[PDB]
RNA sequence: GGGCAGAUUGAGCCUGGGAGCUCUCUGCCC
């Protein structure tokens, strides 16, 4: 902990199909 | 598609200072 240079995770994201 | 939670003892980026961003996997919810 006590650090930076990251964000909250995701479920899924966009794609071509 | 999106949110919330878990993997940075998963990958990448910019920056002096992220309540930061891109990218992937899993669970729950819409």
Swiss-Prot record:
Full protein stretch here: 44 to 60 of 86
What organism does the record attribute this protein to?
Human immunodeficiency virus type 1 group M subtype B (isolate HXB2) (HIV-1)
According to the record, the segments passing through the membrane are none
Anything else the record notes? This truncated variant has a premature stop codon. It may have arose as a consequence of tissue culture passaging. HIV-1 lineages are divided in three main groups, M (for Major), O (for Outlier), and N (for New, or Non-M, Non-O). The vast majority of strains found worldwide belong to the group M. Group O seems to be endemic to and largely confined to Cameroon and neighboring countries in West Central Africa, where these viruses represent a small minority of HIV-1 strains. The group N is represented by a limited number of isolates from Cameroonian persons. The group M is further subdivided in 9 clades or subtypes (A to D, F to H, J and K).
- List residues modified as N6-acetyllysine: 7-8
Lineage, top-rank taxon, reads Viruses
UniProt-annotated location(s): Host nucleus, Host nucleolus; Host cytoplasm; Secreted
Function noted in UniProt: Transcriptional activator that increases RNA Pol II processivity, thereby increasing the level of full-length viral transcripts. Recognizes a hairpin structure at the 5'-LTR of the nascent viral mRNAs referred to as the transactivation responsive RNA element (TAR) and recruits the cyclin T1-CDK9 complex (P-TEFb complex) that will in turn hyperphosphorylate the RNA polymerase II to allow efficient elongation. The CDK9 component of P-TEFb and other Tat-activated kinases hyperphosphorylate the C-terminus of RNA Pol II that becomes stabilized and much more processive.
Q: What is known of its domains?
A: The cell attachment site mediates the interaction with ITGAV/ITGB3 and ITGA5/ITGB1 integrins, leading to vascular cell migration and invasion. This interaction also provides endothelial cells with the adhesion signal they require to grow in response to mitogens.
The entry's family comment says: Belongs to the lentiviruses Tat family.
- The listed location of motif Nuclear localization signal, RNA-binding (TAR), and protein transduction is 6-14
Its recorded name reads Protein Tat
Per UniProt, the ranges with Basic residues bias are 5-16
Q: How is it modified after translation?
A: Asymmetrical arginine methylation by host PRMT6 seems to diminish the transactivation capacity of Tat and affects the interaction with host CCNT1. Acetylation by EP300, CREBBP, GCN5L2/GCN5 and PCAF regulates the transactivation activity of Tat. EP300-mediated acetylation of Lys-7 promotes dissociation of Tat from the TAR RNA through the competitive binding to PCAF's bromodomain. In addition, the non-acetylated Tat's N-terminus can also interact with PCAF. Lys-7 is deacetylated by SIRT1.
